[PDB]
Write a protein that holds these residues in place. Structure first.
Motif, short mmCIF file in Angstrom:
data_model
loop_
_atom_site.label_atom_id
_atom_site.label_comp_id
_atom_site.label_asym_id
_atom_site.label_seq_id
_atom_site.Cartn_x
_atom_site.Cartn_y
_atom_site.Cartn_z
N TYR A 17 23.18 1.04 21.36
CA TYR A 17 23.30 2.49 21.30
C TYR A 17 22.06 3.21 20.75
N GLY A 46 19.07 4.23 21.38
CA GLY A 46 18.24 4.38 22.58
C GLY A 46 18.97 5.17 23.66
N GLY A 79 23.78 4.71 25.68
CA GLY A 79 24.26 3.39 25.50
C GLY A 79 25.67 3.17 26.04
CA LIG Z 1 22.19 6.27 22.10
#
Ligand SMILES: [Ca+2]
Ligand SMILES: CCCCCCCCCCCCCCCCCCOC[C@@H](O)COP(=O)(O)OCC[N+](C)(C)C
Ligand SMILES: [Ca+2]
Ligand code: NA
Lengths: 124, 124
Positions: B28, B30, B33
């Protein structure tokens, strides 16, 4: 990697704040990037986006499954001069070169304050 | 906005390199996700994603049409302590608090370097 691209924009542009200056600028600086880019600077970002697409299409990058902002490479800076290390293998070099090209491009293009934080839904 | 989130992380975690550190970690931390968060720190990120989703649906942010990373807010850093300015209007305050909650959560959770740069298609 994105943190490296950030490093490069500081290298090419001394006191820059890369995320505060270039993210969410025009139609292409940021994620997404759709529409007619609004200036030379925006065009830097749109070229960068095309470069990463070409990265994903590059045979040398076949084993990178995540996106090129997750691909680390080797680079150095010297007096505002960015260096993609020859030590880089093919994909890392190509993605290093995308970030370098956009780093220089940002430095030479005019910065238009009024293009920052557009309403992309309306204008892009 | 995203640069202020970065600056909040620097605040809560004086040793921080936030992009280098927390971008492209787990499932997650980034580009959005999905999947099961791989550890507590990764759950910090899922929570922030959720909070951003909540902001996107909050009546007071109804004029915020771009992503919550484009929303400017006022915050202050002082002694490792983050303060979302009580002057913030409701949307500004909400997103600032999503961010503040996340930096704090990042400052509390273990960092597990085998969880960095996961192949997310394979493990998320
Ligand atoms: Ca994220
Ligand atoms: C400062 C260090 C902290 C680490 C954070 C670094 C990451 C920030 C990234 C900055 C660039 C922006 C990336 C953010 C992308 C997250 C964006 C992740 O959001 C996912 C959803 O919004 C996507 O859903 P859709 O838009 O497909 O929903 C479709 C809805 N209908 C209309 C079809 C039903
Ligand atoms: Ca873009
Ligand atoms: Na930003």
């Amino acid at each position: 990697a994105l943190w490296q691209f950030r490093s490069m924009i500081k290298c090419a542009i001394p006191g820059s704040h890369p995320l505060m200056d270039f993210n969410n600028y025009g139609c292409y600086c940021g994620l997404g990037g759709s529409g007619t880019p609004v200036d030379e600077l925006d065009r830097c970002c749109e070229t960068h986006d095309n470069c990463y697409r070409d990265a994903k299409n590059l045979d040398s990058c076949k084993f990178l499954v995540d996106n090129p902002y997750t691909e680390s490479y080797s680079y150095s800076c010297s007096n505002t001069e960015i260096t993609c290390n020859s030590k880089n293998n093919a994909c890392e070099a190509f993605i290093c070169n995308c970030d370098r090209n956009a780093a220089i491009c940002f430095s030479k293009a005019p910065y238009n304050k009024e293009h920052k934080n557009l309403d992309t839904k309306k204008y892009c």
